[PDB]
Amino acid sequence: SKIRIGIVGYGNLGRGVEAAIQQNPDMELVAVFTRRDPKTVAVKSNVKVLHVDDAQSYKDEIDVMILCGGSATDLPEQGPYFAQYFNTIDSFDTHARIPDYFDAVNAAAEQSGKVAIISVGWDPGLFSLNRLLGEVVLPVGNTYTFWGKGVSQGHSDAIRRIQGVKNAVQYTIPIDEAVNRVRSGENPELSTREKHARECFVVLEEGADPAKVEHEIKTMPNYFDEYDTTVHFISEEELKQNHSGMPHGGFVIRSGKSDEGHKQIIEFSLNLESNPMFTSSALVAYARAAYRLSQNGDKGAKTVFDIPFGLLSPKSPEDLRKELLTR
Amino acid sequence: SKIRIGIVGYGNLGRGVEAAIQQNPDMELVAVFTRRDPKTVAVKSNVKVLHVDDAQSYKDEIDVMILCGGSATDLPEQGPYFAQYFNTIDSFDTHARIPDYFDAVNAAAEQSGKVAIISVGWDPGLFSLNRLLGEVVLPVGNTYTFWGKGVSQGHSDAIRRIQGVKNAVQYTIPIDEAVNRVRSGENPELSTREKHARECFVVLEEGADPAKVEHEIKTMPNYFDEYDTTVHFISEEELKQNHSGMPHGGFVIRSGKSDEGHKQIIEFSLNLESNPMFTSSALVAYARAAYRLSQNGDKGAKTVFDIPFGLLSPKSPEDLRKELLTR
């Protein structure tokens, strides 16, 4: 029998999960859940769409609910809410709130006897795994994480909420000189501004003051005041033509030394033409783990740090040992 | 209380473990065990050296025994032998024997209620993890593993067993063109001969026939006949001067696609100035896991596929969530 997946939220992430389920034949999409009236949400695979208030009635129809919502508002409620009725996966990515979200999700999942895996994706998720690995395998050394080149939704949206901006896309861009110094094993000390540049393409509103927009962008706290930021005004057509993708990538590098002074370097890198399609394929892999864990009577909140990779595969442990352990 | 480690075999690996223990303050090396008379084995940290026949008398003195022997003959007996009396880690790397070694070690570890983790290292080990990850995150695409540039002990030793060769060192070397094709997402079909070249430096015995040595090297089954192989005869002094390191490295790459055609690429790469120092730094990380698993009543044999990364850290699960989960 197939692992029965439900999706909450049908944004780029939910649409990404639906596509990943197409590539995971042990799985089937039973339902999509939305805040919206169902009738307004056109699901490509033509599965039933339903309102989230109905979801509790599907407790016995779904093995794993993959929560596709944002972290600022959707997850803080949805994580604990759905953990009461299903095993869940989410992409929660808010640094300062992780301990609280975890405790919250965990309390509900313990209560319900369900498995919740939070903060899955590539960062957090894959990259977090690699920060950890770097640090345990090479305890004397330094970890560097770089993001990009690619489109940051959050920074794009930040620019767009400026009055005077009609639309925008921002690229987060590792600065080469900084990545080469890391790669070449110099173990540099690097400030925020030395690691990433930011590059913005902006479509002005009628009557805007460019200089004022540029100024609000470059002096915005958190988003841009710590980085070299460039701004470029272009038309809507240009924004659609050249900046419609959601590529991204990055790398986690650990550079350390043996106790006899040998320079050792670990690098895990990603180069994605679709960020949300990637993130969502990870979500679905982890759903498999949540299921197998649930099936062995496990429960509670987990992160990627608690999940053995074998559980992510449909292949049996024997076949993994046979096929992938070496050569 | 420190985690109490014993080492069996004091070649490059065991000496690597000793160095890694210096970098892991939750650990202490209690004993080295050898086949040799102990008096012939000079341990740099001046820990006691003992004969392997003694080791059983040490079961209540050691938490984890890290087996540093070769896979061709030491491990196939040592794995099951020591798994009767301790938790063990090993680097078993013989593809075709893994299912049998696993079964053998597992039987003993189950019987004794001990935890054995086999085939740890960078390949197998880290790279195997990344083959697995690639494949579950990106189910539609291709995995490629390359090794080097670096010194392969096995191929060096194979050249040295030729009559007429006094000594040698061989380098396994990713062929650039093949790696670029993989990196650029072409998903090429690649033969053995297309992925790696082999490069040999050879110090002839007095009286040797160079042409004949060269011919035996290049037509040797398994080691060289499937590859473009070059041979270079040099002196002993040059071999000491320029070919004394044990560097190595490589990468595992998955190139896949979203169900909508987006090209996605995962790469995990290593660049090591000391292969054995690296491999042994991993063994010691995993020893930590073996101990935790032991302490929670777990038992039986494991591979890296069964070990959650969290268990490899000395930091609590809480501190890992806080610190490494993002940013």
XYZ file of C-alpha atoms in Angstrom:
654
model
C 0.000 0.000 0.000
C 1.133 3.537 -0.884
C 2.206 6.102 1.643
C -0.669 8.543 1.689
C 0.405 12.146 1.576
C -1.535 15.299 2.266
C -0.275 18.845 1.450
C -1.143 22.014 3.414
C -0.774 25.193 1.335
C -0.447 25.329 -2.402
C 2.139 27.896 -3.088
C 5.380 27.161 -4.850
C 6.307 24.705 -2.150
C 3.030 22.742 -2.273
C 3.202 22.691 -6.004
C 6.738 21.407 -5.656
C 5.641 18.569 -3.395
C 2.970 17.529 -5.857
C 5.637 17.216 -8.522
C 7.963 15.332 -6.220
C 5.193 12.832 -5.454
C 5.095 12.125 -9.166
C 8.702 10.918 -8.797
C 8.026 8.826 -5.769
C 5.896 5.875 -6.769
C 5.532 4.517 -3.242
C 3.541 7.616 -2.611
C 0.212 9.105 -3.360
C -1.270 12.553 -2.966
C -4.675 12.150 -1.371
C -5.648 15.770 -0.776
C -4.565 19.432 -0.798
C -5.599 21.728 2.049
C -5.875 25.523 1.750
C -7.138 28.595 3.623
C -8.775 29.724 0.430
C -12.033 28.473 -0.860
C -11.073 25.208 -2.490
C -12.763 26.241 -5.733
C -10.154 29.000 -6.206
C -7.182 26.619 -6.021
C -6.470 24.791 -9.285
C -4.492 21.669 -8.514
C -2.548 20.363 -11.488
C -2.842 16.602 -10.654
C -6.594 17.094 -9.979
C -6.593 15.712 -6.474
C -9.373 16.932 -4.146
C -8.820 20.365 -2.653
C -10.277 21.060 0.724
C -10.400 23.726 3.369
C -8.007 23.249 6.316
C -10.946 23.231 8.892
C -11.966 19.931 7.211
C -8.596 18.288 7.650
C -9.221 16.835 11.096
C -11.907 14.678 9.440
C -9.194 13.116 7.250
C -7.071 11.829 10.094
C -7.467 8.276 8.985
C -6.989 8.990 5.239
C -3.497 10.406 5.399
C -0.166 8.944 6.575
C 1.897 12.157 6.389
C 0.835 15.767 6.077
C 3.506 17.899 4.515
C 3.128 21.486 5.716
C 4.039 23.807 2.879
C 3.445 27.143 4.610
C 5.733 30.049 5.507
C 7.475 30.270 8.826
C 6.588 33.830 9.863
C 2.921 33.152 10.334
C 1.595 29.924 8.860
C 3.802 27.374 10.612
C 3.787 28.664 14.180
C 0.141 27.696 14.310
C -0.084 24.913 11.714
C 2.795 22.865 13.108
C 1.265 22.338 16.496
C -2.255 22.176 15.027
C -1.642 19.347 12.530
C 0.813 17.471 14.774
C -2.300 16.711 16.887
C -3.799 14.576 14.047
C -1.052 13.535 11.651
C 2.574 12.891 11.177
C 3.987 16.105 9.681
C 6.902 17.508 7.800
C 7.694 21.178 7.607
C 10.348 23.683 6.394
C 10.386 25.860 9.421
C 13.293 28.206 8.955
C 13.203 30.903 11.619
C 16.471 30.855 13.549
C 15.522 32.544 16.786
C 12.166 30.574 17.037
C 13.440 27.061 16.448
C 13.752 26.010 20.097
C 10.169 27.324 20.752
C 8.585 25.817 17.587
C 10.284 22.516 18.337
C 9.001 22.474 21.932
C 5.500 23.412 20.725
C 5.403 20.877 17.895
C 6.960 18.279 20.162
C 4.317 18.684 22.897
C 1.544 18.091 20.374
C 3.268 15.170 18.642
C 4.024 13.470 22.011
C 0.357 13.991 23.049
C -0.928 12.463 19.796
C 1.695 9.752 19.346
C 2.658 11.216 15.995
C 5.962 11.975 14.325
C 6.867 15.475 13.337
C 9.987 16.389 11.453
C 10.557 20.150 11.413
C 12.896 22.378 9.511
C 13.484 20.137 6.525
C 14.778 21.467 3.237
C 18.231 22.399 2.055
C 18.885 25.237 4.564
C 17.772 24.290 7.033
C 18.094 20.542 6.367
C 20.853 19.269 4.051
C 23.189 22.143 4.896
C 22.541 21.705 8.589
C 23.540 18.047 8.272
C 26.758 19.163 6.646
C 27.594 21.764 9.138
C 27.299 19.084 11.730
C 29.318 16.465 9.850
C 32.074 18.931 9.179
C 32.371 19.766 12.798
C 32.409 16.199 14.177
C 34.806 14.802 11.507
C 37.089 17.799 11.614
C 36.802 19.267 15.175
C 39.718 21.605 14.752
C 38.755 23.981 12.023
C 36.098 26.377 10.719
C 32.650 26.091 9.024
C 31.506 28.572 6.361
C 28.025 28.575 4.797
C 27.326 30.528 1.603
C 23.939 30.926 -0.113
C 23.448 31.605 -3.778
C 23.712 32.628 -6.388
C 19.941 32.834 -6.412
C 16.644 34.462 -5.666
C 15.706 35.212 -2.108
C 11.897 35.390 -1.774
C 12.174 37.168 1.546
C 14.535 39.913 0.236
C 12.480 40.294 -2.969
C 9.316 40.753 -0.886
C 11.096 43.172 1.395
C 11.857 45.472 -1.550
C 8.357 45.135 -2.910
C 6.729 46.412 0.290
C 8.604 49.697 -0.372
C 6.115 52.393 -1.555
C 7.279 53.189 -4.981
C 8.255 49.644 -5.833
C 5.781 47.820 -8.059
C 7.744 44.560 -8.107
C 11.219 43.214 -7.566
C 13.639 40.335 -7.535
C 16.740 40.122 -5.488
C 19.745 37.806 -5.909
C 21.949 36.709 -3.054
C 25.457 36.233 -4.362
C 28.508 34.689 -2.747
C 31.491 36.975 -3.135
C 34.179 35.036 -5.083
C 37.239 36.293 -3.346
C 35.683 35.205 -0.075
C 34.728 31.750 -1.286
C 38.292 31.171 -2.758
C 39.980 32.021 0.474
C 37.724 29.545 2.193
C 38.333 26.893 -0.443
C 42.055 27.340 -0.478
C 42.136 26.597 3.282
C 43.254 29.967 4.631
C 40.557 29.793 7.315
C 39.787 33.488 6.957
C 37.720 35.652 9.367
C 34.904 37.025 7.331
C 32.310 39.622 8.166
C 28.764 39.593 6.839
C 29.636 42.108 4.139
C 32.649 40.082 2.950
C 30.658 36.867 2.256
C 27.646 37.960 0.209
C 26.626 40.751 -2.092
C 23.021 41.608 -2.945
C 21.676 42.592 -6.237
C 18.270 43.985 -6.908
C 16.129 44.391 -9.959
C 13.295 46.761 -9.433
C 10.265 47.908 -11.319
C 9.244 51.390 -10.200
C 5.695 52.545 -9.532
C 4.446 55.508 -11.459
C 5.698 58.694 -9.855
C 8.409 57.116 -7.792
C 11.509 58.803 -6.569
C 14.288 56.336 -7.697
C 16.846 57.828 -5.342
C 14.499 57.480 -2.424
C 13.737 53.802 -3.305
C 17.356 53.072 -3.717
C 18.025 54.668 -0.320
C 15.296 52.719 1.416
C 16.650 49.518 -0.058
C 20.275 50.122 0.873
C 19.588 51.311 4.451
C 16.955 48.728 5.263
C 17.802 47.006 8.552
C 18.419 43.256 8.558
C 17.872 42.819 4.850
C 20.483 45.112 3.262
C 22.391 47.574 5.525
C 25.121 45.021 6.288
C 25.856 44.184 2.584
C 27.056 45.799 -0.672
C 23.836 46.171 -2.480
C 23.193 47.253 -6.007
C 19.937 48.397 -7.463
C 18.818 48.410 -11.098
C 15.486 49.706 -12.330
C 13.923 47.839 -15.180
C 10.494 47.318 -16.710
C 7.926 44.724 -15.839
C 8.579 42.963 -19.144
C 12.209 42.681 -18.399
C 11.505 41.408 -14.897
C 9.251 38.648 -16.350
C 11.586 37.786 -19.167
C 14.900 37.584 -17.339
C 14.000 37.160 -13.644
C 11.171 34.688 -13.470
C 13.176 31.698 -12.284
C 13.658 30.594 -8.739
C 17.194 29.310 -9.004
C 19.410 28.987 -5.975
C 22.292 27.084 -4.429
C 25.223 27.388 -2.125
C 27.770 25.475 -0.120
C 28.844 24.456 3.260
C 32.582 24.077 3.646
C 34.550 22.818 6.606
C 38.236 23.440 6.587
C 40.234 21.914 9.362
C 43.447 20.216 10.206
C 44.652 16.892 11.534
C 46.426 16.932 14.775
C 49.661 16.785 12.745
C 48.728 19.859 10.689
C 47.267 18.236 7.524
C 44.760 20.544 5.717
C 41.506 18.772 5.167
C 38.436 20.269 3.338
C 34.816 19.058 3.142
C 32.428 20.755 0.718
C 28.681 20.138 0.126
C 27.324 22.244 -2.668
C 24.032 22.732 -4.495
C 23.225 24.187 -7.816
C 19.449 24.379 -8.350
C 17.390 25.683 -11.229
C 14.431 25.363 -8.905
C 14.712 26.091 -5.241
C 11.178 25.183 -4.253
C 11.176 22.053 -6.446
C 14.373 20.961 -4.601
C 13.150 21.837 -1.134
C 9.941 20.023 -1.775
C 11.692 16.767 -3.085
C 13.495 16.788 0.250
C 10.273 17.228 2.095
C 8.831 14.173 0.435
C 11.890 12.048 1.145
C 11.602 12.950 4.763
C 7.894 12.146 4.750
C 8.998 8.553 4.094
C 11.175 8.682 7.096
C 8.317 10.114 9.225
C 6.105 7.291 8.127
C 8.607 4.423 8.866
C 9.381 5.999 12.229
C 5.682 6.351 13.025
C 5.155 2.674 11.987
C 7.853 1.518 14.529
C 5.944 3.280 17.298
C 8.242 6.315 17.477
C 6.670 9.791 18.171
C 7.499 13.430 19.016
C 9.295 16.213 17.139
C 12.536 15.404 15.220
C 14.929 17.331 13.143
C 17.197 16.127 10.363
C 19.730 15.443 13.167
C 17.628 12.512 14.416
C 16.941 10.796 11.092
C 19.181 8.050 9.739
C 19.498 8.289 6.037
C 18.450 4.729 5.508
C 14.903 5.665 6.577
C 14.699 8.108 3.599
C 14.934 5.304 1.071
C 12.204 3.034 -0.261
C 14.942 0.334 -0.716
C 15.445 -2.137 2.166
C 18.451 -1.779 4.547
C 19.971 -4.934 2.979
C 19.701 -3.491 -0.539
C 21.318 -0.249 0.579
C 24.292 -2.094 2.109
C 24.586 -4.114 -1.020
C 24.270 -1.287 -3.589
C 25.576 1.977 -2.089
C 27.869 1.179 0.805
C 30.767 1.113 -1.642
C 31.946 1.114 -5.314
C 33.721 10.341 32.468
C 35.537 10.072 29.178
C 34.630 7.594 26.495
C 37.316 4.981 26.746
C 38.702 3.940 23.385
C 40.909 1.041 22.397
C 42.739 0.766 19.047
C 43.556 -2.517 17.295
C 46.412 -2.282 14.677
C 48.882 0.541 14.697
C 49.570 1.295 11.057
C 48.617 4.604 9.436
C 45.022 4.167 10.499
C 45.653 3.439 14.150
C 48.120 6.274 14.310
C 45.445 8.448 12.734
C 42.976 7.423 15.439
C 45.468 8.341 18.111
C 45.836 11.803 16.655
C 42.052 12.220 16.297
C 41.609 11.339 19.984
C 43.780 14.331 20.846
C 41.102 16.497 19.124
C 38.169 14.908 20.944
C 38.495 15.869 24.659
C 35.487 13.669 25.617
C 37.696 10.779 24.705
C 40.653 8.895 26.005
C 42.863 6.223 24.498
C 43.302 3.476 27.049
C 45.187 0.860 25.069
C 46.701 -0.154 21.720
C 46.503 -3.803 20.676
C 48.761 -5.441 18.078
C 49.781 -8.795 16.578
C 53.405 -7.921 17.126
C 55.216 -8.032 20.378
C 54.162 -4.837 22.052
C 57.746 -3.930 22.770
C 58.278 -3.488 19.004
C 55.407 -0.975 18.635
C 56.293 2.567 19.694
C 53.127 4.468 20.423
C 53.604 8.212 20.185
C 51.180 9.068 23.075
C 52.846 6.475 25.354
C 49.720 4.545 26.085
C 50.152 0.870 26.961
C 50.664 -1.514 24.070
C 49.368 -5.010 24.401
C 48.969 -8.118 22.393
C 45.540 -8.832 20.836
C 45.245 -12.178 22.716
C 45.106 -10.050 25.893
C 42.278 -7.814 24.834
C 39.402 -9.911 26.170
C 40.776 -9.335 29.672
C 40.075 -5.666 28.952
C 36.283 -5.695 28.259
C 35.326 -3.710 31.349
C 38.127 -1.120 30.620
C 37.112 -0.012 27.162
C 33.902 1.506 25.763
C 34.725 1.321 22.087
C 37.359 -0.616 20.185
C 38.239 0.948 16.901
C 39.530 -1.717 14.531
C 42.216 -0.216 12.361
C 43.118 -3.277 10.271
C 42.844 -3.966 6.495
C 39.754 -5.612 5.069
C 41.455 -8.343 2.968
C 42.428 -10.411 6.094
C 42.503 -8.611 9.492
C 38.860 -7.542 9.609
C 37.124 -10.666 8.407
C 38.307 -12.263 11.661
C 38.790 -9.244 13.945
C 35.302 -7.792 13.375
C 33.421 -10.795 14.609
C 36.057 -11.597 17.259
C 36.036 -8.226 18.996
C 32.288 -7.746 18.526
C 31.900 -10.541 21.093
C 33.498 -8.362 23.843
C 33.221 -4.727 22.791
C 31.488 -2.123 20.781
C 33.493 -1.723 17.563
C 33.971 0.568 14.635
C 35.726 -0.531 11.480
C 36.589 0.618 7.954
C 35.610 -2.510 6.141
C 35.688 -1.691 2.446
C 35.462 -4.887 0.410
C 32.346 -4.458 -1.822
C 31.645 -8.023 -2.626
C 31.968 -9.185 1.098
C 29.927 -6.568 2.879
C 26.654 -8.512 3.143
C 28.626 -11.510 4.586
C 30.822 -9.377 6.893
C 27.775 -7.497 8.092
C 25.971 -10.766 8.780
C 29.009 -12.173 10.599
C 29.597 -9.059 12.707
C 25.909 -8.679 13.330
C 25.540 -12.224 14.712
C 28.318 -11.671 17.201
C 27.217 -8.185 18.265
C 23.612 -9.386 18.768
C 24.857 -12.365 20.849
C 26.993 -10.085 22.996
C 24.583 -7.091 23.139
C 27.174 -4.809 21.657
C 27.035 -2.225 18.936
C 29.165 -2.655 15.818
C 29.365 0.028 13.151
C 31.126 -1.269 10.022
C 32.534 0.328 6.925
C 33.044 3.804 8.329
C 35.384 6.212 6.664
C 35.023 8.466 3.686
C 34.377 5.780 1.027
C 32.717 3.763 2.312
C 31.110 6.103 4.867
C 30.634 9.804 4.023
C 30.446 9.190 0.281
C 28.002 6.339 0.726
C 25.787 8.713 2.734
C 25.894 11.155 -0.147
C 25.102 8.597 -2.753
C 22.064 7.732 -0.717
C 20.998 11.366 -0.164
C 21.402 12.228 -3.802
C 19.238 9.416 -4.819
C 16.369 9.989 -2.372
C 16.271 13.818 -2.822
C 16.603 13.569 -6.563
C 15.028 10.183 -7.574
C 15.131 10.989 -11.271
C 18.749 11.324 -12.321
C 22.292 9.897 -12.041
C 24.951 9.423 -9.324
C 28.649 9.578 -10.122
C 31.536 8.888 -7.704
C 35.090 9.932 -8.490
C 38.187 9.314 -6.343
C 41.317 11.368 -6.218
C 43.533 12.908 -7.050
C 45.413 10.805 -4.561
C 47.476 7.857 -3.524
C 45.852 4.502 -3.595
C 47.639 2.140 -1.199
C 46.139 -0.951 -2.819
C 47.353 -0.037 -6.342
C 50.763 1.069 -5.015
C 51.168 -2.295 -3.246
C 50.002 -4.117 -6.345
C 52.838 -2.548 -8.356
C 55.348 -3.327 -5.641
C 54.564 -7.065 -5.680
C 55.857 -7.084 -9.317
C 59.364 -8.696 -9.397
C 61.571 -5.974 -10.664
C 59.831 -3.269 -8.639
C 61.572 -2.166 -5.481
C 58.941 0.374 -4.517
C 56.160 2.426 -5.964
C 53.382 4.926 -5.530
C 50.313 5.199 -7.654
C 47.871 8.115 -8.061
C 44.207 7.696 -8.974
C 43.100 10.754 -10.934
C 39.643 11.906 -12.021
C 39.706 12.673 -15.721
C 38.735 16.370 -15.986
C 36.658 16.172 -19.068
C 34.520 13.490 -17.488
C 34.059 15.479 -14.277
C 32.993 18.655 -16.250
C 30.447 16.775 -18.211
C 29.057 15.494 -14.954
C 29.089 18.932 -13.312
C 27.467 20.671 -16.210
C 24.420 18.347 -15.917
C 24.779 16.401 -19.207
C 24.243 13.140 -17.351
C 26.789 11.336 -19.564
C 27.210 7.508 -19.773
C 30.781 6.952 -18.680
C 32.911 3.830 -18.816
C 35.606 2.946 -16.283
C 38.309 4.168 -18.608
C 36.584 7.540 -19.070
C 36.362 8.449 -15.378
C 39.844 7.918 -13.949
C 43.387 7.740 -15.146
C 46.208 6.017 -13.230
C 49.656 7.293 -12.845
C 52.554 5.273 -11.477
C 55.919 6.201 -10.051
C 58.282 3.267 -9.874
C 61.649 2.558 -8.489
C 63.207 -0.361 -10.375
C 65.166 -3.255 -8.746
C 68.737 -3.819 -9.934
C 68.577 -5.881 -13.124
C 65.014 -5.158 -14.031
C 63.518 -5.122 -17.515
C 61.606 -1.751 -17.608
C 59.490 -2.737 -20.589
C 58.431 -5.857 -18.890
C 57.529 -4.050 -15.596
C 55.644 -1.512 -17.564
C 53.743 -4.322 -19.407
C 52.873 -6.132 -16.191
C 51.578 -2.941 -14.683
C 49.459 -1.988 -17.694
C 47.907 -5.448 -18.282
C 47.297 -6.293 -14.625
C 43.694 -7.450 -14.273
C 41.486 -5.478 -11.925
C 44.038 -2.854 -10.947
C 45.093 -1.411 -14.338
C 43.784 -3.074 -17.570
C 40.547 -1.113 -17.668
C 42.381 2.290 -17.361
C 44.824 4.605 -19.201
C 47.867 4.030 -17.148
C 51.247 5.781 -17.238
C 54.439 4.658 -15.746
C 57.458 6.710 -14.710
C 60.683 5.242 -13.359
C 62.439 7.336 -10.787
C 64.887 6.858 -7.959
C 64.214 6.019 -4.407
C 65.282 9.474 -3.267
C 62.821 11.039 -5.629
C 60.121 8.693 -4.429
C 60.820 9.785 -0.787
C 61.095 13.406 -1.659
C 58.095 13.890 -3.866
C 55.702 10.991 -3.219
C 55.657 10.519 0.560
C 52.267 12.053 1.273
C 49.026 10.170 1.562
C 46.793 12.781 -0.028
C 43.448 11.962 -1.458
C 39.968 13.312 -2.172
C 37.100 13.043 -4.585
C 33.389 13.678 -4.968
C 29.975 12.277 -5.223
C 27.636 14.132 -7.546
C 23.960 13.664 -8.274
C 22.485 15.320 -11.289
C 18.784 15.027 -11.535
C 15.710 16.924 -12.629
C 12.421 18.088 -11.097
C 9.373 16.562 -12.599
C 9.062 19.892 -14.500
C 12.558 19.589 -16.042
C 14.625 21.750 -13.646
C 18.312 20.653 -13.535
C 19.460 20.115 -9.991
C 22.983 19.157 -8.794
C 24.247 17.947 -5.425
C 27.982 17.688 -4.898
C 29.962 16.408 -1.821
C 33.647 16.745 -2.205
C 36.817 16.115 -0.223
C 40.281 17.448 -0.517
C 42.593 15.740 1.973
C 46.253 16.168 2.676
C 46.028 13.019 4.752
C 43.684 10.281 3.825
C 44.330 8.124 6.906
C 44.147 11.096 9.277
C 40.746 11.909 7.734
C 39.454 8.369 7.730
C 40.468 7.899 11.340
C 38.952 11.299 12.470
C 35.665 9.792 11.120
C 36.153 6.527 12.895
C 36.422 8.397 16.141
C 33.286 10.447 15.550
C 31.424 7.279 14.888
C 32.839 5.644 18.013
C 30.901 8.328 19.943
C 27.781 7.272 18.248
C 28.471 3.609 18.954
C 28.780 4.425 22.584
C 25.530 6.385 22.756
C 23.708 3.659 20.991
C 25.249 1.155 23.365
C 24.168 3.188 26.397
C 20.509 3.316 25.119
C 20.468 -0.486 25.047
C 20.861 -0.748 21.254
C 22.904 -3.625 19.707
C 23.800 -5.433 16.509
C 25.762 -4.250 13.501
C 25.082 -0.853 11.861
C 26.355 1.019 8.914
C 26.469 4.761 8.443
C 22.913 4.344 6.989
C 21.539 3.645 10.510
C 23.261 6.480 12.425
C 21.633 9.871 12.972
C 24.167 12.586 12.747
C 23.134 13.949 16.082
C 24.706 10.976 17.862
C 28.127 11.920 16.365
C 28.254 15.130 18.348
C 29.273 15.621 21.948
C 26.803 18.602 22.114
C 23.291 17.866 23.364
C 20.417 17.585 20.804
C 19.098 20.878 22.114
C 22.372 22.746 21.488
C 22.523 21.343 17.979
C 19.014 22.633 17.154
C 19.973 25.976 18.538
C 23.361 26.338 16.868
C 23.472 24.401 13.571
C 19.899 23.987 12.419
C 20.199 27.344 10.588
C 22.169 30.592 9.960
